[PDB]
Design an enzyme around this catalytic site. Sequence first.
Site, mmCIF file in Angstrom:
data_model
loop_
_atom_site.group_PDB
_atom_site.id
_atom_site.type_symbol
_atom_site.label_atom_id
_atom_site.label_comp_id
_atom_site.label_asym_id
_atom_site.label_seq_id
_atom_site.Cartn_x
_atom_site.Cartn_y
_atom_site.Cartn_z
ATOM 1 N N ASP A 118 0.802 -1.222 0.000
ATOM 2 C CA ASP A 118 0.000 0.000 0.000
ATOM 3 C C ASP A 118 0.840 1.280 0.000
ATOM 4 O OD1 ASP A 118 -2.639 -0.929 -0.186
ATOM 5 O OD2 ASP A 118 -2.589 -1.474 1.922
ATOM 6 N N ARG A 177 0.473 6.729 0.258
ATOM 7 C CA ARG A 177 -0.528 5.680 0.347
ATOM 8 C C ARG A 177 -1.320 5.640 -0.955
ATOM 9 N NH1 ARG A 177 -4.028 2.174 0.294
ATOM 10 N NH2 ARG A 177 -5.060 1.248 2.128
ATOM 11 N N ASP A 237 -6.846 -1.610 -1.170
ATOM 12 C CA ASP A 237 -6.362 -2.169 0.088
ATOM 13 C C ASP A 237 -5.640 -3.493 -0.170
ATOM 14 O OD1 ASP A 237 -5.940 -2.028 2.972
ATOM 15 O OD2 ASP A 237 -7.738 -3.326 3.103
ATOM 16 N N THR A 238 -4.340 -3.505 0.052
ATOM 17 C CA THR A 238 -3.565 -4.740 0.002
ATOM 18 C C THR A 238 -3.533 -5.344 1.408
ATOM 19 O OG1 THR A 238 -1.350 -3.929 0.479
ATOM 20 C CG2 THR A 238 -2.060 -3.732 -1.813
ATOM 21 N N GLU A 249 -1.805 -6.834 4.710
ATOM 22 C CA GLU A 249 -0.567 -6.546 5.438
ATOM 23 C C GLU A 249 0.377 -7.753 5.356
ATOM 24 O OE1 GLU A 249 -0.942 -3.021 7.125
ATOM 25 O OE2 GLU A 249 -2.250 -3.470 5.377
ATOM 26 N N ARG A 286 0.390 10.941 5.312
ATOM 27 C CA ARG A 286 0.745 10.212 4.105
ATOM 28 C C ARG A 286 0.109 10.858 2.884
ATOM 29 N NH1 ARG A 286 -1.030 4.042 5.459
ATOM 30 N NH2 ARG A 286 -3.024 5.146 5.248
HETATM 31 C C1 LIG Z 1 -6.496 4.859 1.133
HETATM 32 C C2 LIG Z 1 -6.885 5.841 2.198
HETATM 33 C C3 LIG Z 1 -6.768 5.572 3.510
HETATM 34 N N1 LIG Z 1 -7.075 6.487 4.491
HETATM 35 C C4 LIG Z 1 -7.031 6.153 5.933
HETATM 36 C C5 LIG Z 1 -8.370 5.568 6.362
HETATM 37 C C6 LIG Z 1 -8.021 4.387 7.225
HETATM 38 O O1 LIG Z 1 -8.113 4.900 8.556
HETATM 39 P P1 LIG Z 1 -7.757 3.966 9.875
HETATM 40 O O2 LIG Z 1 -6.214 3.927 10.070
HETATM 41 O O3 LIG Z 1 -8.398 4.807 10.982
HETATM 42 O O4 LIG Z 1 -8.341 2.580 9.676
HETATM 43 C C7 LIG Z 1 -6.558 4.061 6.926
HETATM 44 C C8 LIG Z 1 -6.293 2.814 6.132
HETATM 45 O O5 LIG Z 1 -4.924 2.896 5.674
HETATM 46 P P2 LIG Z 1 -4.139 1.518 5.659
HETATM 47 O O6 LIG Z 1 -5.065 0.618 4.890
HETATM 48 O O7 LIG Z 1 -2.761 1.779 5.164
HETATM 49 O O8 LIG Z 1 -4.096 1.119 7.121
HETATM 50 O O9 LIG Z 1 -6.044 5.162 6.176
HETATM 51 C C9 LIG Z 1 -7.696 7.675 4.165
HETATM 52 O O10 LIG Z 1 -8.037 8.460 5.036
HETATM 53 N N2 LIG Z 1 -7.816 7.953 2.817
HETATM 54 C C10 LIG Z 1 -7.487 7.101 1.794
HETATM 55 O O11 LIG Z 1 -7.705 7.459 0.645
HETATM 56 CA CA LIG Z 2 -3.119 -2.351 3.634
#
Ligand SMILES: Cc1cn([C@H]2C[C@H](OP(=O)(O)O)[C@@H](COP(=O)(O)O)O2)c(=O)[nH]c1=O
Ligand SMILES: [Ca+2]
Length: 129
Positions: free
Chosen positions: A15, A29, A34-35, A37, A75
């Site tokens: 990701d 990011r 969603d990949t 982990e 990010r």
């Molecule tokens: C892809 C993406 C993730 N995110 C946030 C929401 C998710 O919040 P939470 O951390 O509260 O779950 C998290 C998921 O990223 P990851 O999938 O890298 O963990 O990153 C955004 O806010 N916008 C986006 O476009």
């Molecule tokens: Ca991920």
Amino acid sequence: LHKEPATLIKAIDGDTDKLMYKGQPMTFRKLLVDTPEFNEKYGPEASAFTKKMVENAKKIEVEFDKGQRTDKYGRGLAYIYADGKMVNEALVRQGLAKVAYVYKGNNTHEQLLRKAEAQAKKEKLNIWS
Ligand SMILES: Cc1cn([C@H]2C[C@H](OP(=O)(O)O)[C@@H](COP(=O)(O)O)O2)c(=O)[nH]c1=O
Ligand SMILES: [Ca+2]
């Protein structure tokens, strides 16, 4: 949307990547995906797929969407391109990512990815096997 230059500092996982953008280091990011982990099924393979793509690229580019450019964790949120090929799409097409986190104002490539996901699922690839 416009492609902007960036340099690979370090591939992190499916990701995320550490990239130099406007001469500053930044975690990016991938939008719309969603990949798994590393510790989950296909996580290692996802990481390996993206690592190869970005490490082997002569040119890395970042494409911001129309909405938020940075998430809550600082990010960058972008479409990532390796020698003109979008990594986000490639992950989904290979069944190593699902379409996810589709928020209004930041979904220019939603349909493209969904098309890819359907093809991956039809081919029963990886996540879909
Ligand atoms: C892809 C993406 C993730 N995110 C946030 C929401 C998710 O919040 P939470 O951390 O509260 O779950 C998290 C998921 O990223 P990851 O999938 O890298 O963990 O990153 C955004 O806010 N916008 C986006 O476009
Ligand atoms: Ca991920």
